[PDB]
A paper describes a structure:
We report four new crystal structures of PRL proteins bound to the CNNM3 CBS-pair domain that reveal the effects of cysteine disulphide formation and nucleotide binding on complex formation.
Oxidation did not induce any large scale conformational changes: the reduced and oxidized phosphatases overlay within 0.6 Å. The largest changes were adjacent to the cysteine residues that form the disulfide bond. Crystal structures of PRL3 (C104A), and the oxidized forms of PRL2 and PRL1 all show a deep pocket which is closed off in the complex with reduced PRL2.
Numbering used by the authors:
A (entry chain C), B (entry chain C): 298 to 446
C (entry chain A), D (entry chain A): 1 to 156
The structure:
Amino acid sequence: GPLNMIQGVLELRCRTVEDVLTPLEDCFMLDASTVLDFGVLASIMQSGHTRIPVYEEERSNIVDMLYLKDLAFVDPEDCTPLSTITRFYNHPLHFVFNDTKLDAVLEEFKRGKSHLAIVQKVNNEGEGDPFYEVLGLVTLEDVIEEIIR
Amino acid sequence: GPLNMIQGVLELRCRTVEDVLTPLEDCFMLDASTVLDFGVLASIMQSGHTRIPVYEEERSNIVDMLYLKDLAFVDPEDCTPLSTITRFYNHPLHFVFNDTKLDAVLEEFKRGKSHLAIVQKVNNEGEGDPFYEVLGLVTLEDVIEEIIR
Amino acid sequence: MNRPAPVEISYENMRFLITHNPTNATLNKFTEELKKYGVTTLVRVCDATYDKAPVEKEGIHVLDWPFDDGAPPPNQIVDDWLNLLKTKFREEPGCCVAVHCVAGLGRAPVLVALALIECGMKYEDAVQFIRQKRRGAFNSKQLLYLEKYRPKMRLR
Amino acid sequence: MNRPAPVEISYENMRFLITHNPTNATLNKFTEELKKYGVTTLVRVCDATYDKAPVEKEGIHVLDWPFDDGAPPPNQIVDDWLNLLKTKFREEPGCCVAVHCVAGLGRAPVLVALALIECGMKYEDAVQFIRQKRRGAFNSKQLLYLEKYRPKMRLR
């Protein structure tokens, strides 16, 4: 209760996105090449997400964000592709480092439009150049959950 | 910051739904007799609400809740009335007394499906019998806002 | 927290059910609730536009006894009521009498309160027990009436 | 927090811009970013499937100098590069050289780092200043190479 929540807010400064995130495989996401038919739209609305990551052509390559609002006058059949929609709005997409402390992410989320960042860690194993590896998503909920439990 | 939030959680037990609520006139709501055409659907999706009160035939008479999920295979034109939809699902509707302390509402909201209750006070002025006067809506957000400021 | 739902009251052989109003559509579902709670007898006491028989074709004795919004029950009405209860609870004990009305917390609860008092419950306790189950209970006049009420005390 | 966006580096007359890759569609928008930051010269150093001319028809000097993923720049490439910078900054001072590549934090930043070092920035500071603007910087080999690097020191 009130005391747990107090511990939770205090623990924000110690725990990080990694602790709270939602791995890629467990996120509702969309293929850029998808077509907005009755089924997929339904799928969208039934997701109860209002902001959905759009990838191509494998879930870690996240190219765009689809907001629910974006669906406003799309008519199933016509059978519009998802990328024509995404290409109507440059909605920005927020990346966060896996390291970042929750208290910081709280602030970011307040200080923006966003209630969901995509999580990244730099990856050093391999001969190649460093890269950013997408771990999955953290949402404002995910952070609140930290507090109201 | 962390200290404000701590004050906020502690102040939950003192402040009430009335402090935090959203008056009726300022809520997105729907007329039972509405028809789900392209415009109103768009209106819905653009609301960025996922659970919308349905009234008839004046906003304080709240008869039903419309969840976004409920829209899943409705085709604009056919031009389905909103009440045929509401009549597909008995989604329950939660009422809360204007008096109730936020800490309590937090718990209710956790302990249910709901992230929004309709607010009521008993009303004694008048010759008639007491009645419950709908003041408007409190949401889980409204309560979180209390904490993360 | 709650929906717009019925509210059952008991003690001793007496069982009441204060309800909402149906439109004629709901009416099959409304009668279903009624049968569930074991009601024999509905007492309308506000006016309602639903047309009862379906409730009577299901064998619930419906009674139209409207009185004034905000008022205490007219004398007859109270007489009929007490008299109604004796016969109906005599007919089959531990059944339910439903009272219904638009508000839910004005005049319908009064009949119920009346019942408990005339059946030996302290006026104070009566109001509190009702207000427990539905808050808002009655108005000043409803309450005035209730305190000033004097059981015969009449309920076999 | 950030998008997948360009990253500008300056000091002294030198200005660099480490970028993402365009597909041929984005390419008009990509060239728009470039002109904004005042770039004259793009150096591809990973391969990219976009077909450059539109960037050249806009008068940005494009250079295809790919090297191995993870590697430090081949000797020539480094020679060409330093030599390229002298001429291009001589052509108009305070303009920008863009370097682009798929990652953003491997080999492209190395050229830039090389530049700053060969232009008198402490190897340590060089790596830190780059890692400030894009974190992840380089790999062990990239870093080995950078420390072991010895400015002539050659940059007029």
